[PDB]
């Protein structure tokens, strides 16, 4: 985006003062839309010396004479050319500025506009900038942040020692990674993206996007009326163990609930019988095992079952021991079908095997599993989209790195999913998602498309739960899926 500001100025010829004005007045219209008529409020605008503060000066000037009271507190040491220009205008229009912050100055205002730091935040907020932000966070006033809540790193969504907690954030052109990833997404409050005059070609040239309803609607496969089971594809799920008899059922219904024609489960006997007692629409093939877990002795049976299907999901409830490790790795090495790889299949995976496969793969790790898979700490991999990108690119796969915001990348294209709620923070929830992905690949979506549609609908089904989210279980989620799909259209 800083690159897109530059090109719109330097190559397209838009005066930077014009971009600055459009930004400021965007903030005013966005506040009007949220608060209704602005004339009864008193505004405290906090302005740094950079262009974010310049945007604030523009905001402050456009409230002059229209609202109860305005006051700019200027916190910077020096002003950029556009901030100076706009400070010059605020003052000529009759605006009050001060350069001293008093703890009790919040008492006299209803709304605080936070235009201290934007995308030009480098390093940690200390000193009076911090005291001021802490004071605003304590005040209970309505906070509107310009571009990004000051103190959010707009590339990572990390808090640089302290950050403003906004009720509304108005950003320009496109959402920034820091609005989308946590903790920054939490501090952004309600996000509005204002068009401030950038040519549409540049806005679209951005290469990381949020997954939207319109995008998932345009990727949903067609259901032509003259169709049969086979039109909508076949999936094999290799899953479960004597410890984890539940996973296969949730995965298998994940696939069916998204419109797959046939799902075959391969689960050790007698645990295979669990699935068909819940959902007799499933096929649940008993695999004979020595101790209740898959091993190399089941390799040939499973490649055979894989001949008649379009995609294979593997991992949920398999268990993690040396015999499962041999079996999964020999299996994926030999399977010449798209693989969706989850849970324990990820925990025992040899990444050399992903390289040597001609057929595609989606991996769906949570950050715990990602940490173990690349031999890093959870904190190093969590919300790390560049690492996810290198992993996908180096291993020729799609990586779906699950969290409150999920990253879906293939190494070139990176998408962020923001649907969902904390009800997905319990067991079985990932098992549903593995199914949904496998099912959509079976219906002819590519691995990346399959993954994009699935994370979105998975999250959206959670939001449709009618009672409190914390009571949501994977079984209820399965029921909500077709509602999520209906509501897409």
């Amino acid at each position: 985006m800083k690159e897109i500001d530059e090109l719109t100025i330097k190559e397209y010829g838009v005066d930077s003062r014009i971009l600055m004005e459009r930004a400021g007045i965007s903030v005013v219209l966005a506040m009007e839309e949220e608060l209704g008529n602005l004339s009864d409020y008193r505004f405290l605008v906090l302005c740094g010396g950079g262009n974010n503060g310049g945007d604030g000066f523009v905001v402050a000037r456009n409230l002059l004479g229209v609202v109860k009271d305005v006051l700019v507190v200027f916190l910077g040491k020096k002003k950029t050319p556009d901030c100076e220009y706009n400070y010059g205008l605020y003052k000529k229009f009759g605006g009050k500025v001060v350069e001293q912050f008093e703890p009790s100055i919040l008492n006299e205002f209803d709304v605080v506009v936070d235009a201290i730091f934007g995308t030009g935040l480098r390093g940690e907020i200390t000193g009076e900038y911090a005291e001021i932000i802490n004071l605003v966070n304590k005040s209970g006033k309505v906070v509107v942040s310009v571009d990004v809540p000051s103190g959010i790193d707009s590339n990572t969504g990390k808090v640089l020692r302290t950050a403003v907690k906004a009720d509304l954030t108005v950003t320009f052109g496109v959402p920034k990674i820091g609005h989308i990833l946590f903790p920054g997404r939490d501090l952004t409050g309600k996000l509005k993206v204002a068009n401030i005059g950038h040519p549409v070609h540049l806005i679209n040239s951005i290469n990381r996007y949020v997954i939207t309803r319109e995008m998932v609607r345009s990727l949903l496969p067609e259901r032509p009326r003259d169709s049969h089971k086979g039109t909508y594809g076949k999936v094999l799920i290799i899953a479960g163990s004597r410890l984890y008899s539940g996973a296969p059922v949730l995965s298998g219904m994940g696939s069916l609930k998204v419109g797959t024609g046939l799902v075959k489960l391969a689960v050790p006997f007698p645990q295979n019988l669990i699935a068909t007692s819940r959902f007799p629409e499933l096929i649940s093939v008993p695999i004979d095992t020595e101790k209740g877990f898959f091993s190399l002795q089941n390799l040939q049976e499973c490649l055979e079952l894989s001949k008649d299907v379009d995609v294979v999901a593997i991992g949920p409830g398999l268990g993690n021991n040396e015999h499962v490790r041999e079996f999964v790795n020999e299996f994926l090495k030999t399977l010449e079908k798209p693989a969706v790889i989850d849970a324990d299949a990820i925990n025992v995976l040899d990444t050399s095997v992903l390289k040597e496969r001609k057929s595609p793969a989606v991996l769906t790790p949570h950050p715990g599993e990602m940490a173990r898979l690349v031999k890093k700490t959870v904190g190093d991999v969590k919300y790390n989209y560049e690492l996810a990108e290198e992993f996908a690119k180096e291993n020729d796969c799609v990586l779906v790195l699950k969290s409150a915001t999920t990253i879906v990348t293939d190494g070139e294209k990176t998408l962020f999913n923001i649907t969902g709620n904390t009800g997905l923070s319990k067991g079985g929830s990932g098992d549903v998602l593995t199914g949904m992905i496998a099912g959509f690949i079976a219906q002819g979506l590519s691995p990346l498309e399959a993954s994009t549609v699935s994370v979105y609908l998975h999250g959206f089904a959670a939001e449709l739960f009618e009672q409190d989210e914390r009571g949501l279980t994977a079984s209820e989620l399965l029921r909500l899926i077709p509602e999520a799909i209906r509501r897409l259209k």
């Binding site: 005013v28 219209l29 009007e32 008529n37 602005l38 004339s39 456009n62 229209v66």
Partner: peptide, 6 residues
């Protein structure tokens, strides 16, 4: 109110 008088 801010942008338009009707």
């Amino acid at each position: 109110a801010w942008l338009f008088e009707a």
